[PDB]
Amino acid sequence: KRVQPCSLDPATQKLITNIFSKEMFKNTMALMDLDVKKMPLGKLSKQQIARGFEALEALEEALKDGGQSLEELSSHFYTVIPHNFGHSQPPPINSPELLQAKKDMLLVLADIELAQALQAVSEQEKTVEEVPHPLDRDYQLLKCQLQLLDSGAPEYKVIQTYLEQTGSNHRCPTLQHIWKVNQEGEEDRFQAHSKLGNRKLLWHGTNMAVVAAILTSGLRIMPHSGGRVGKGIYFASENSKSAGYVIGMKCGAHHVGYMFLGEVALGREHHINTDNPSLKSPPPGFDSVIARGHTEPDPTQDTELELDGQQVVVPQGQPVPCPEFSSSTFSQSEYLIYQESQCRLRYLLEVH
Ligand SMILES: CN(C)CC(=O)Nc1ccc2[nH]c(=O)c3ccccc3c2c1
Numbered sequence: 001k002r003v004q005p006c007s008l009d010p011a012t013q014k015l016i017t018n019i020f021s022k023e024m025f026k027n028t029m030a031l032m033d034l035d036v037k038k039m040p041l042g043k044l045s046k047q048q049i050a051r052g053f054e055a056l057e058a059l060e061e062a063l064k065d066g067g068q069s070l071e072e073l074s075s076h077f078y079t080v081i082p083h084n085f086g087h088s089q090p091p092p093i094n095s096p097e098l099l100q101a102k103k104d105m106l107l108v109l110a111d112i113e114l115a116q117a118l119q120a121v122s123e124q125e126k127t128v129e130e131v132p133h134p135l136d137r138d139y140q141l142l143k144c145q146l147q148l149l150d151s152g153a154p155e156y157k158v159i160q161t162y163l164e165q166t167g168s169n170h171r172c173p174t175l176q177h178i179w180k181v182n183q184e185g186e187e188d189r190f191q192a193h194s195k196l197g198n199r200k201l202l203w204h205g206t207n208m209a210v211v212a213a214i215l216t217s218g219l220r221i222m223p224h225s226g227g228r229v230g231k232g233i234y235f236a237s238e239n240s241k242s243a244g245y246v247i248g249m250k251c252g253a254h255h256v257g258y259m260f261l262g263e264v265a266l267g268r269e270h271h272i273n274t275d276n277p278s279l280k281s282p283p284p285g286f287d288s289v290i291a292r293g294h295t296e297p298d299p300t301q302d303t304e305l306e307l308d309g310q311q312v313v314v315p316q317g318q319p320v321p322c323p324e325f326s327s328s329t330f331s332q333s334e335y336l337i338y339q340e341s342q343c344r345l346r347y348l349l350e351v352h
Pocket residue numbers: 104203204205206207227234235236241242243245333334335
């Protein structure tokens with residue numbers, strides 16, 4: 001069989017290599033204390049991950065009788081999801097904090113399986129005399145359009161300014177590339193909230209392990225997912241806040257990482273200043289919940305982008321003190337929506 005030449009540019013080739021890298025996945029599983037030998041990448045199954053959540057639920061039930069002890073229930077979760085702790089006795093999941101930690105860990109592992117199941121070779125490919133370059137194939141598996149922007153791009157500078165003004169003044173994240181994300185299947189559903197104004201291009205820092213899944217399914221509100229503002233999709237107006245979630249891998253000397261810029265239909269905003277991990281939707285009449293931080297990218301420096309005939313607000317100024325929320329429980333703002341349809345992936349950034 002002939003292997004057709006790759007039609008991807010260096011940047012997009014590098015990207016597609018990283019986000020499907022089996023070494024990158026194993027690294028992530030190792031960073032989560034998971035036994036990579038007892039749980040090989042090719043062994044990951046939706047069934048196993050489900051059995052894991054079942055164990056987490058029954059354990060959650062025992063945290064809220066004559067049932068099963070926490071020490072005993074925990075021991076079963078580690079039987080289904082093999083952990084690596086230098087061959088010592090694993091920790092008992094006896095706290096709500098540790099409980100959600102394992103849920104978050106399984107959710108990430110769930111997106112690792114999604115990428116694996118996605119790469120599955122179908123019969124259609126096996127009955128063709130010519131195959132695409134491995135990278136083209138992977139790129140096509142995402143069913144998502146990635147157009148690399150340049151310096152001469154209109155929205156490039158807006159994004160670059162947005163990045164440098166809301167990033168950490170010292171540990172500056174270096175912009176390398178910007179991709180225009182056209183996830184096909186996100187426009188149709190996003191046209192629902194086309195009558196809904198108040199749009200803002202917000203940050204979403206993600207670890208490299210779920211980048212493929214996000215490019216394939218978009219930002220999702222998974223079961224067992226949570227946080228300080230409940231069960232929704234988390235965003236940030238400050239790059240620095242999102243970057244704290246960007247877990248990247250080494251590359252010779254640099255620390256590669258990826259961030260998303262999403263067009264969020266905020267509509268009527270319900271402002272809170274206190275953690276509320278029970279939220280599953282905004283209060284009646286509201287379309288989004290916003291955790292106002294002690295600071296906010298100077299609203300007077302906001303600019304607007306024209307995306308698909310829509311005016312989208314894009315912050316451009318440094319964080320300024322917000323006295324009205326000076327004693328808030330959030331240092332930085334956390335934007336929330338509680339239905340996936342309100343988010344539209346717009347740009348993918350590669351930072352160093
Ligand atoms: C790696 N985990 C600790 C992250 C997790 O479990 N969920 C998650 C995963 C990615 C996230 N990205 C953000 O830009 C963000 C901004 C304000 C508040 C939360 C997030 C955010 C949260």
